[PDB]
Design an enzyme around this catalytic site. Structure first.
Site, PDB file in Angstrom:
ATOM      1  N   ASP G   8       0.799  -1.173  -0.077  1.00 47.66           N
ATOM      2  CA  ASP G   8       0.037  -0.032  -0.135  1.00 47.66           C
ATOM      3  C   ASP G   8       0.659   1.409  -0.075  1.00 47.66           C
ATOM      4  O   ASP G   8       0.340   2.352  -0.139  1.00 47.66           O
ATOM      5  CB  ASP G   8      -0.976  -0.021   1.277  1.00 47.66           C
ATOM      6  CG  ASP G   8      -1.966  -0.935   1.338  1.00 47.66           C
ATOM      7  OD1 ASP G   8      -2.901  -1.297   0.562  1.00 47.66           O
ATOM      8  OD2 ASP G   8      -1.799  -1.843   2.358  1.00 47.66           O
ATOM      9  N   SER G  33       2.314   6.722   0.918  1.00 47.76           N
ATOM     10  CA  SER G  33       1.220   5.999   1.634  1.00 47.76           C
ATOM     11  C   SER G  33       0.061   6.278   0.973  1.00 47.76           C
ATOM     12  O   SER G  33      -0.469   7.191   0.807  1.00 47.76           O
ATOM     13  CB  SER G  33       1.221   6.326   3.136  1.00 47.76           C
ATOM     14  OG  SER G  33      -0.029   5.666   3.808  1.00 47.76           O
ATOM     15  N   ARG G  34      -0.585   5.023  -0.023  1.00 44.47           N
ATOM     16  CA  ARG G  34      -1.791   5.424  -0.795  1.00 44.47           C
ATOM     17  C   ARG G  34      -2.994   5.656   0.225  1.00 44.47           C
ATOM     18  O   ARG G  34      -3.719   6.215  -0.396  1.00 44.47           O
ATOM     19  CB  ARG G  34      -1.939   4.158  -1.493  1.00 44.47           C
ATOM     20  CG  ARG G  34      -0.758   4.022  -2.855  1.00 44.47           C
ATOM     21  CD  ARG G  34      -1.091   2.952  -3.655  1.00 44.47           C
ATOM     22  NE  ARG G  34       0.001   2.659  -4.470  1.00 44.47           N
ATOM     23  CZ  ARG G  34      -0.124   2.489  -5.919  1.00 44.47           C
ATOM     24  NH1 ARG G  34      -1.571   2.617  -6.451  1.00 44.47           N
ATOM     25  NH2 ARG G  34       0.806   2.685  -6.919  1.00 44.47           N
ATOM     26  N   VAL G  35      -2.869   5.250   1.438  1.00 44.51           N
ATOM     27  CA  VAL G  35      -4.104   5.514   2.350  1.00 44.51           C
ATOM     28  C   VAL G  35      -4.028   6.904   2.804  1.00 44.51           C
ATOM     29  O   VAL G  35      -5.257   7.492   2.994  1.00 44.51           O
ATOM     30  CB  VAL G  35      -3.897   4.430   3.643  1.00 44.51           C
ATOM     31  CG1 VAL G  35      -4.693   4.773   4.568  1.00 44.51           C
ATOM     32  CG2 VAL G  35      -4.087   3.109   3.161  1.00 44.51           C
TER      33      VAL G  35
END
Ligand SMILES: Nc1ncnc2c1ncn2[C@@H]1O[C@H](COP(=O)(O)OP(=O)(O)OP(=O)(O)O)[C@@H](O)[C@H]1O
Ligand SMILES: [Mg+2]
Lengths: 115, 340, 52, 269, 115, 52, 86
Positions: G8, G33-35
């Protein structure tokens, strides 16, 4: 290419040409980034002679006449040594760089510079 | 084409009066190249002291693979009997190519560049024979016929690289086995430095123990000083005028660089090399122009050979050095420069 | 001082005659050596009567 | 040889490209320092011109020799984008007029690259100064200016000029030649004699014009240096892009060769 | 190399030397093409200290006398720390670069500068 | 007079050294002849004997 | 390559930063961080925006730190702030 086979005059002319062309090859990256004007007064003179030597090595052939139109040239060993020795000594520092391109013997570079 | 054979053949020629026997092993060379080396050994008077072992390019890969071991065995005869020998392997990279052929035709599984798994052991088994043996070993080998004498076999293997790539499997293996290496550089060779030895990359693990007293003292630190001069010349190339320490190091490095140049088939004795080293390290070349260093050296040697022949003969006995010889050389160089 | 200067110039003058003479004498001595070494080389080169 | 040597060449050129990008702004900063120094020296020169104009018109009793019928400025350093070359090329154009006129020439030189030029062609130097800071002081110019003024009073020079670059704009340096020596309701209360006053003021006037030419040439130099470092930054970027293409070829060849040696080794076992 | 294992004085000296040498690594390639004179007043001083630190890392060993010619030097932990802190703080900026090459402790560098 | 004495002494030393260089260069030129005439005679007589 | 594509996000640590005294060695210019902000508390989500901007400005201006005396005051302000945040 040995002094005992071809004599000292030919051997030193050939070694002189290789030294100038090797030093010009080392400056290629600096000349590309900063240009010719940043070099030392000694390197500027050597680069100018290297460019003339590199052009004087060219020669129109009798089998290449069909490709361009120019007549072919046969150059003797005596005329070859005399031309490069003169360019190394500085006897032709005043003639323009394009006068050495495709001319056979050294005397024809002197006639080409008249145009 | 940068002088690897020229360096090893001149080293064989210099042994004709040293008392060291020579062996030249030609692997995968054309027969006319082998015949030209033999003609040059004969022309220099060195053939009567040399064994030439030939395995030319048309011969079976088995003969090319075995030739270095046959030549090594002929050299070992002198070592085991309390005598000294020198062996040249003109191309171990061609011996490795012959062994790779045999191994692939025998269907043995290939390694890192299609070379057999044991290509390291091919060269390590050959090169570990070159050694110096104790008096007790010679005394035991000869059943007491030879006593109080050591024996030796010195080796000069040659390796060819492709466009300077040392990461190749065979060069990596051999560089890891020898007691040192002499790196020849094409850029220095094209620039007219003809012995073309890169002092920064080249190194000897025996060092000063392998030198006579006079050369050991006159050459201490020259290798690392030249290595630092090459870096200094590149670092200070376009910068404005620097301090005396920088000018002193740069002007000295330029003179030693021009001095290290030598011609082929022209070896120098201990005394000739000593005069050349002394004139440089004691500061006598500081007034001499870079373009005149070769002429100064040749003239000085010719001068000492005429006016000081008894001193050269004393230096050439064992390469000894003391205050008497130091002062003798000093007086001669001063008189030379003040009158020539 | 002018009279003394002529004597001092007279020392530099005679030194120049002597030093120039030694430079040419050493050249003739060097020339003789070169020819003698060439004769011994040419005599030694005669091994070709057997070597070739 | 392979990928490793190419990666080292890229890193070397990448380090150089970052400073040529920064030095372009350093040259712009120094260009602005030179431009403020050009403006600060104008009030003095224009007032001296106003005084001499009235003091000559109002006093027809005396004509100064400077009212009846080359100093070359150049840089001391590298990175000039044709600045000195365009100036030397132009000097020959006005000198050609002097050759058709048959007149003799005397030369004065400011800066190391100008001295190197005339020394490489046999040019007759009557005076010369060099190694001046990027922010020069007028008292260093007095010497070179006086030799050229004396040659006029001695009748050796008919006309004198200052050869220098002019700041047209931040992207354009113009080579120029400007004549130096040959140039109503109230009167002044002269304490010393008027000749002494006119003679003293004319010397200050010529020195001030030479100093202004020198300061404007330094502003042109920083502008030329900005273009040169901009171009070096751009030229290095093309070399890095080409070397990246050669590196990618070596990356693909290394993977293909390793697999071809590995597959051959597993086929034999 | 942890302050909780050795001490903060040793650790700060080590990280100080590393910081100076790491910054010099990016300037080395710059000076070779555009020259030293174009760097900042802080960079010129730092480069000189980095070249001196690089030389003060050298030491002649007793087992290397056959290669070096000079005698062997043993240096202690406190002597090592004091020598590197002196070059970092500027106590030796006046000494020439060649004085730190092959000289055991810091005292001998002050003596070599006089030869 | 002392300046002229210094210049005349220096002139003659450069001249004597120029004459010295010519004397040595002619010896080098002669040495090559001594070696090459011996080389051609030795090779020719060796081939004469080989044909015989 | 396989694991970078599976995860992720990535935290990249660099040897040049670690040798320059930046102990955590986290290269914030390439790490991601894709979140993102969904994995932060209100206080950290609000304060981190100006800090990312300061490090971005520092990466763009870092070459001028040796020539800071010749910079424009508005640019000098970004550089000095970027150095203190770094
Ligand atoms: N000291 C020297 N001075 C001048 N020329 C030299 C010198 N040493 C070698 N050369 C010349 O350079 C060339 C070197 O050839 P050589 O065969 O020795 O090199 P090599 O590396 O062994 O070449 P190859 O790969 O073909 O075997 C020859 O023309 C030789 O005469
Ligand atoms: Mg060879």
């Amino acid at each position: 290419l040995d002094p005992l086979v071809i004599g000292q005059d030919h051997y030193d002319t050939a070694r002189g040409v290789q030294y100038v062309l090797q030093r010009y090859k080392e400056l290629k990256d600096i000349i590309a980034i900063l240009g010719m004007d940043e070099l030392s007064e000694a390197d500027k003179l050597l680069v100018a002679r290297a460019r003339k030597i590199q052009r004087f090595l060219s020669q129109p052939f009798f089998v290449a006449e069909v490709f361009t139109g120019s007549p072919g040239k046969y150059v003797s060993l005596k005329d070859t040594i005399a031309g490069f020795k003169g360019i190394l000594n500085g006897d032709y520092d005043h003639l323009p760089e394009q006068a050495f391109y495709m001319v056979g013997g050294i005397e024809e570079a002197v006639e080409k510079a008249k145009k | 084409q940068i002088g690897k054979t020229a360096l090893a053949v001149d080293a064989i020629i210099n042994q004709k009066d040293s008392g060291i026997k020579c062996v030249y092993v030609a692997i995968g060379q054309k027969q006319s190249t082998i015949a030209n080396v033999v003609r040059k050994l004969e022309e220099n008077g060195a053939l009567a002291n040399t064994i030439v072992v030939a395995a030319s390019a048309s011969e079976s890969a088995a003969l090319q693979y075995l030739a270095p071991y046959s030549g090594c065995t002929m050299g070992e005869y002198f070592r085991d009997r309390g005598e000294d020998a020198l062996i040249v392997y003109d191309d171990l990279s061609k011996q490795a190519v012959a062994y790779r052929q045999i191994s692939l035709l025998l269907r043995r599984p290939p390694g890192r560049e299609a070379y057999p798994g044991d290509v390291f052991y091919l060269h390590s088994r050959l090169l570990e024979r070159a050694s110096r043996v104790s008096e007790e070993y010679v005394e035991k080998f000869t059943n007491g016929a030879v006593t109080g004498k050591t024996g030796s076999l010195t080796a000069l293997p040659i390796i060819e690289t492709q466009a300077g790539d040392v990461s190749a499997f065979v060069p990596t293996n051999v560089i890891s086995i020898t007691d040192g290496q002499i790196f020849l550089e094409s850029a220095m060779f094209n620039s007219g430095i003809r012995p073309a030895v890169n002092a920064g990359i080249s190194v000897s693990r025996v060092g000063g123990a392998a030198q006579t007293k006079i050369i050991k003292k006159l050459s201490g630190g020259i290798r690392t000083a030249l290595a630092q001069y090459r870096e200094l010349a590149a670092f200070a190339q376009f910068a404005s005028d620097l301090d005396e320490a920088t000018r002193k190091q740069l002007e000295h490095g330029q003179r030693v660089t021009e001095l290290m140049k030598q011609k082929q088939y022209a070896p120098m004795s201990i005394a000739e090399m000593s005069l050349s080293l002394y004139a440089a390290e004691r500061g006598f070349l500081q007034d001499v122009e870079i373009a005149k260093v070769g002429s100064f050296e040749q003239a000085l040697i010719s001068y000492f050979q005429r006016e000081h022949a008894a001193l050269l003969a004393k230096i050439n006995e064992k390469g000894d050095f003391n205050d008497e010889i130091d002062a003798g050389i000093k007086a001669g160089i001063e008189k030379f420069k003040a009158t020539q | 001082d002018l009279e003394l200067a002529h004597e001092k110039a007279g020392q530099q003058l005679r030194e120049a005659k002597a030093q120039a003479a030694e430079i040419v004498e050493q050249a003739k001595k060097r020339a003789n050596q070169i020819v003698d070494e060439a004769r011994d080389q040419a005599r030694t080169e005669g091994e070709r009567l057997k070597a070739q | 040889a392979g990928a490793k040597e190419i990666r080292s060449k890229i890193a070397s050129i990448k380090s150089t490209q970052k400073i040529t990008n920064a030095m372009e702004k350093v040259a712009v900063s120094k260009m602005r320092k030179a431009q403020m120094r050009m403006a600060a020296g104008r009030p003095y020169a224009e007032r001296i011109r106003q005084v001499i104009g009235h003091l000559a018109n109002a006093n027809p009793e005396y004509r100064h020799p400077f009212m009846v019928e080359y100093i070359v400025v150049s840089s001391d350093r590298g990175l000039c984008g044709g600045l000195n070359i365009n100036l030397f090329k132009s000097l020959v154009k006005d000198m050609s007029g002097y050759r058709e006129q048959g007149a003799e020439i005397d030369l004065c030189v400011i800066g190391s690259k100008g001295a190197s030029f005339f020394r490489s062609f046999g040019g007759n130097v009557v005076a010369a100064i060099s190694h001046l800071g990027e922010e020069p002081s007028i008292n260093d110019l007095i010497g070179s200016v006086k030799v050229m003024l004396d040659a006029y009073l001695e009748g050796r020079i008919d006309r004198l000029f200052v050869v220098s670059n002019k700041f047209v704009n931040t992207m354009t340096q113009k080579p120029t030649v400007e004549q130096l020596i040959p140039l109503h309701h109230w009167d002044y209360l002269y304490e010393p004699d008027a000749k002494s006053l006119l003679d003293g003021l004319l010397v200050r006037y010529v020195e001030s014009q030479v100093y202004q030419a020198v300061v404007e040439n330094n502003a042109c130099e920083q502008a030329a240096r900005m273009i040169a470092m901009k171009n070096a930054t751009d030229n290095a970027g093309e070399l890095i892009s080409d070397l990246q293409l050669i590196y990618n070829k070596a990356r693909q060849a290394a993977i293909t060769q390793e697999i071809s040696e590995i597959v051959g080794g597993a086929a034999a076992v």
